[PDB]
């Protein structure tokens, strides 16, 4: 546990879906770059038509990431129902993540619950037909390997509920060397739907799941066992 383990201020983003692995390995400036929080804002402003794909730079070197999720519901939702739906969504998700963090991760169950429902970052898509967003938990740090093992129970949770927001959970994102589209950019140069920010969080630093900055209210937990004994 050195200084670099309690901090990660380097951002690794892509610029096009389906980048070949060799082009990723050679770190060519044509496909992949490194960035800072302030610099990334300048890059987006200078390219109002760009397309970025946030991802993990190195898997085995650094695995600690923030907890993130994805939702894609193909129907408009009224505001009062939307508020009602999102209250239950946080309630059910918080319990399920904490429960696994206590039964196979050896962490304090009540500590995780307080840290997640306290401060979470919510986005909203600009499309008016469907409702989608990227909910990111801020003060809950864990390794990529834990989230991969978290996939099986999350799929069971999404399939066994009634709330439309928690039933449309995208469980396919959790894999090796994941990609999440950054806020404010398009999907393809032909797409006209982008993601915008939400109050009270305004700085861009609050929307990258690779940013590790553990403060006083942060909590950490990781799988004690490895991924090879788990047949």
């Amino acid at each position: 546990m050195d200084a670099a383990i309690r901090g990660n201020d380097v951002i690794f983003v892509l610029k096009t879906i389906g980048v070949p692995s060799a082009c990723r390995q050679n770190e060519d400036p044509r496909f992949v770059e490194a960035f800072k929080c302030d610099e990334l804002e300048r890059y987006i402003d200078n390219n109002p038509e760009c397309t970025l794909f946030e991802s993990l730079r190195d898997e085995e070197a650094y695995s600690i990431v923030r907890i993130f999720m994805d939702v894609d519901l193909d129907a408009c939702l009224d505001e009062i129902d939307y508020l009602t739906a999102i209250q239950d969504f946080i309630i059910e998700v918080s319990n399920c993540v904490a429960r696994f963090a206590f039964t196979e991760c050896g962490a304090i169950h009540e500590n995780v619950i307080k840290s997640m429902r306290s401060n979470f970052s919510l986005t909203k898509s600009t499309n008016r037909d469907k409702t989608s967003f990227h909910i990111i938990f801020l003060d809950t740090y864990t390794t990529m390997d834990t989230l991969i093992a978290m996939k099986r129970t999350l799929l069971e949770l999404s399939r066994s509920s009634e709330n439309p927001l928690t039933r449309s959970i995208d469980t396919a994102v959790y894999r090796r060397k994941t990609t999440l589209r950054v806020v404010g950019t398009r999907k393809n140069p032909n797409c006209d739907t982008i993601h915008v920010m939400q109050p009270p969080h305004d700085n861009i630093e609050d929307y990258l799941f690779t940013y590790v900055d553990m403060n006083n209210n942060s909590y950490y937990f990781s799988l004690q066992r490895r991924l090879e004994d788990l047949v």
């Binding site: 059910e92 319990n95 429960r99 009540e110 399939r159 066994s160 009634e162 039933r167 449309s168």
Partner: protein
């Protein structure tokens, strides 16, 4: 092949029979479907249902609708949405996975209110204090108490004593690992929280829960 294409279908095994699934949908529409005979396991996501409106719709509470409704399948549950103007009618979801009381037992389990001790007793967490009993288990009392912290469609289902018994029986079949108790030696457990000793502050509610204190002083704390 399809294995490398997608591990998805339109009707995977384990789902309920199609005729039963449609029966559930016909229950939500309190009125009667007019073109019901146009549905089978191959076109139910394309044929629009021409409902008749004698009574107000059970989904939007309007007297009648301009356009027919239409179904769609997603993530193991068929969705009901109305064509035309999407904001005119609400969204209703019909599940297909399994039963409901097992889901209730699961939800009661995630919140970490029931635990298994070495002696075999099941401690519960009610009124901000861990309680237990041998001749009469307290699981049903905890279920009825925690009824409130669940969504609406789950709360009303939790009143019939037989159904509470079923949920309790489901709960008792998930606890397999024992948990030790009373490992913190410098705390004073009260009837409505635990008073910390190292700095004098008095926690309550969620905060005063990780300290698994079984025995308690028996009276409430009065900070005044």
């Amino acid at each position: 092949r399809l294995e490398d294409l997608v591990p998805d279908k339109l009707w995977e095994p384990g789902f309920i029979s199609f005729e039963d699934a449609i029966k559930r949908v016909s229950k939500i529409f309190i009125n009667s479907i007019i073109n019901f005979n146009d549905l089978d396991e191959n076109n139910f996501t394309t044929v629009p249902l021409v409902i008749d409106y004698v009574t107000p719709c059970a989904l939007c509470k309007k007297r009648s609708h301009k356009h027919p409704h239409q179904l769609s399948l997603e993530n193991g549950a068929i969705r009901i949405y109305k064509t035309g103007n999407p904001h005119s009618c609400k969204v209703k979801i019909v599940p297909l996975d399994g039963n409901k009381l097992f889901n209730i037992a699961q939800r009661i389990l995630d919140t970490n209110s029931v635990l298994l001790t070495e002696r075999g007793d099941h401690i519960v967490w009610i009124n901000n204090s861990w309680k237990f009993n041998s001749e009469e288990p307290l699981i049903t009392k905890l279920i009825l108490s925690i009824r409130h912290q669940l969504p609406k469609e789950y709360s009303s289902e939790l009143l019939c004593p037989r159904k509470r018994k079923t949920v309790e029986a489901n709960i008792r079949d998930m606890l397999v690992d024992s948990v030790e108790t009373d490992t913190y030696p410098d705390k004073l457990p009260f009837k409505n929280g635990v008073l910390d000793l190292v700095d004098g502050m008095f926690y309550s509610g969620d905060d005063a829960k990780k300290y698994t204190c079984t025995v308690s002083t028996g009276f409430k704390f009065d900070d005044t």
